Amino acid sequence: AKQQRAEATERVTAGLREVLAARERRAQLEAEGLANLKTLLKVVAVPATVAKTLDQARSAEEIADQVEILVDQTEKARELDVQAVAWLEHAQRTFETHPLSAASGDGPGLLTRQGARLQALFDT
Amino acid sequence: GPLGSAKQQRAEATERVTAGLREVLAARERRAQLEAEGLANLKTLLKVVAVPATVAKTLDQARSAEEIADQVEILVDQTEKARELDVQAVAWLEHAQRTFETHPLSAASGDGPGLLTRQGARLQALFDT
Amino acid sequence: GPLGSAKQQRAEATERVTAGLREVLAARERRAQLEAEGLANLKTLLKVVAVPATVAKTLDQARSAEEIADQVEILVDQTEKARELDVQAVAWLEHAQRTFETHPLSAASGDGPGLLTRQGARLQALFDT
Amino acid sequence: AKQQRAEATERVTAGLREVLAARERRAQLEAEGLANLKTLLKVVAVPATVAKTLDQARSAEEIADQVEILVDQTEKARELDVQAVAWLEHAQRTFETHPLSAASGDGPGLLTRQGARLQALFDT
């Protein structure tokens, strides 16, 4: 009867030893995995935004969060773009007719020199 | 009298000259004030459509339509540079998604979906347009 | 910017010119205003001694020292003409007194003194000076 | 007794007749005297003031009144003269020093041309 109680106290201690050991090993490997994830992600050029923060990321989760941030920034850039173009075609039209800027006998409109690159923005 | 009416003819001559300058000067001061009014209204007209914060913080202070035109050239450049960053950001995000689907630290395992699974929605949005 | 700072150099040039006229005009307007102040004080100075009614009613309205000078020439002439009337008036009054002393309608009779007897006082006054 | 009463009623009527007659005669002569007084007065030139009124005078008394008036006017003229000279020497002095009128490098004072006749007035 006593034999089974001694054997049990030991199966627990060995169990802890095995659990602690398996954890320390999984940790070290996951670290390697995180290091290599970062390497893999860098194969294609990394936006400056996240690059300087990507390396400091302490888990894959932090990298994913950093991705979300970039996606958010990228959405907001596109709607500024939507405003910016809306205002620029408005600003162009305004400049074409206004006496302080319009194409007179005294030379072209103030925005004629920029007429080229403006039409680029509008179509695309 | 002899003295007094002669003196009066000199005064009228002095005034006709002073009046002459006054007239020229006033034409200038008026052309100025009207151009100023023109600039004020130019700004009002431009603001009818919402002004990008970039341009707004400097637009009201503009001392001529030329300065406003320069402020436009700037916005155009910023917007071009934003648009080529958009290309970089999407190329990398397309790569990151691909990377995440397959990597053991992030892949959809038996333990729940991939880490970027919840963002697949917003991602495919960016990709098509 | 390229457009805006060039425009600024033209504005400063326009203003330097406008400022130039403004400066010339102001020098004139100031020389005028000071001469005006001079005239006002000329009048004040002249009134320190009582001004003959002749000259007074016109002195304040005077548009220059010249008009005041003319108004003086006048007073001098009036005063000369008053002084030669004084000679006529006294010659005749001397004659009238002499006439009255002897004429039966006026002479000191037994009925009381001559008619100009009561005025002999004021008469001899006029005569000596 | 009755003789003296009749004679008395008549001495009164004749008395009135004589009184009325002596008065009408004294009147006519005094008139002649007034006419000739006027003539005598005119031997020496008559001031314009009184001349136009001297002829209309209806008695010697009115002529004397007209004399008084002339004497009054003549006194007042002399004291205006006293003022006028007082102010003119003051006005001269003022003009000599004041910048709007003074003898400059640009020609003499405004009252220099009148300097001559002014000194006439001051001395006499």
Curated annotation (Swiss-Prot), chains B, C:
Function, as annotated, reads:
Large tegument protein that plays multiple roles in the viral cycle. During viral entry, remains associated with the capsid while most of the tegument is detached and participates in the capsid transport toward the host nucleus. Plays a role in the routing of the capsid at the nuclear pore complex and subsequent uncoating. Within the host nucleus, acts as a deneddylase and promotes the degradation of nuclear CRLs (cullin-RING ubiquitin ligases) and thereby stabilizes nuclear CRL substrates, while cytoplasmic CRLs remain unaffected.
Family of this protein: Belongs to the herpesviridae large tegument protein family.
Quote the subunit structure annotation. Answer: Interacts with host CUL1 and CUL4A; these interactions inhibit the E3 ligase activity of cullins. Interacts with inner tegument protein. Interacts with capsid vertex specific component CVC2. Interacts with the major capsid protein/MCP. Interacts with VP16; this interaction is important for outer tegument association to the capsid. May form homodimers.
List where in the cell it is found: Virion tegument; Host cytoplasm; Host nucleus
Protein name listed in UniProt: Large tegument protein deneddylase
Q: How is it modified after translation?
A: Proteolytically processed, possibly into several polypeptides. Enzymatic activity is only detectable following cleavage of the UL36 protein, which occurs late during viral replication.
> According to the record, which residues of the full protein are present here?
1625 to 1748 of 3164
